[PDB]
Symmetry: none
Subunit: 252 residues, 2 copies
Amino acid sequence: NAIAVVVDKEPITTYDIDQTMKALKIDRNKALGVLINEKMEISQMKQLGIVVNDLELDDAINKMLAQNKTTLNAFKANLKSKNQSYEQFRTNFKKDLEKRKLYEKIASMAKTDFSDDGAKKFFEQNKDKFTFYTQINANIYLSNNPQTLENIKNTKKTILKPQNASLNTSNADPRLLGLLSQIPVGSFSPVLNGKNGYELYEVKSKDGTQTPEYEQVKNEVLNAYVSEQRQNFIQDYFDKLRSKINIEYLRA
Amino acid sequence: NAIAVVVDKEPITTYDIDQTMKALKIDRNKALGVLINEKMEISQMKQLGIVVNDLELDDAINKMLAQNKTTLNAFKANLKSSYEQFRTNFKKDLEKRKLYEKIASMAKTDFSDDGAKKFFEQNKDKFTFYTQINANIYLSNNPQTLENIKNTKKTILKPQNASLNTSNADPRLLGLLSQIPVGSFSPVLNGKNGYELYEVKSKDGTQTPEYEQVKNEVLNAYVSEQRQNFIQDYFDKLRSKINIEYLR
């Protein structure tokens, strides 16, 4: 209808704000915030030469199909029932990929610390994110066949009977405690190597000191430390950008 | 407290029954059933000549310690949370394993591919196949180091990451590895002694396996099922043959 905001030089119309207010449960200045950030991304996409082919797009579609254990035809039938169009799907999927290429590119610009002391210090600063329970009770399922336990982590229907372990600090190895403490009440662990054969744990309850401990978590802190460095650099990159660009509201 | 039931001359007491109801949170009749089974096994160890002498016991422990690259003393301190308890339980676990191997050996198990194929048909979804599998490989000229990596999971040290597929790998390795959960280890294998494989990625090409792709896996599952069904039936029969007295 009329132009409400120009970002760099890219216009944002009252129509955009309107149609965007609809797309979410949000609204200007929320719809306005989204639109402002979308224009920043599009402009960075141009400057960094971000682009997605039809072949990249199609290749990405297939990979999503496999990851979801489906097929194009089946995925296309499901969509039909959603009364949603394949063509729309492709369009929206493409934009997600462009955005993903953009954030990959941006993150490739950063200098990441992978040092042991870097991580430790990150640990000491964020111990809360690594709290393990001291007492965990769960249903354990056992089998010689790991695929029969897999069919339970996916298919929640099963035989035969689970045991009910009360994993005390001395009832079992603390790595597993750390593992299950993540898993939410009700949900399954991965299928694990066990003494006799394979094991699957369905947590029933989690209590305990919430105790922490490094070296027993070395691998988790490093991923989180690195994840956070990525997130911050990306954020920082856009803060600095939100500062350097002209955002003008119009008499609209 | 007081003797409630006698199984082939092994007594089960109120204290045992009330205390087993505790460690398992099950009812009187279900606790009884557990202790009865325990006494049945003890009775069978006598009939089947099952015994673990101190010599064999000390050897099994030493070899357990050798594997984990540890030592009696180190292992004794690590236990601070008893050693004699550990020993007697280690012994009982071993007596039990020998018991079940002897019983399983009385089954006339079918080891034929003919039988395994019939099992396969009725159990297809219990086996999978991926044409692409990414795995950490740990090679050692020593079976013990590898076995400890599997149990401990502590690097010792750096594995070769391999992207295995149908051009690259024996179809028996892919059949094997296809069953292993991402994150989990294969058994220790020899090419020779030996190789351990650590599964990082599959799917990577899911497919319905042909019997021939997964036959070792199928065959092992088929043998295990026959053995467990024989052992289970063996104790159900014994349940109504062995001499049991209840109070009153």
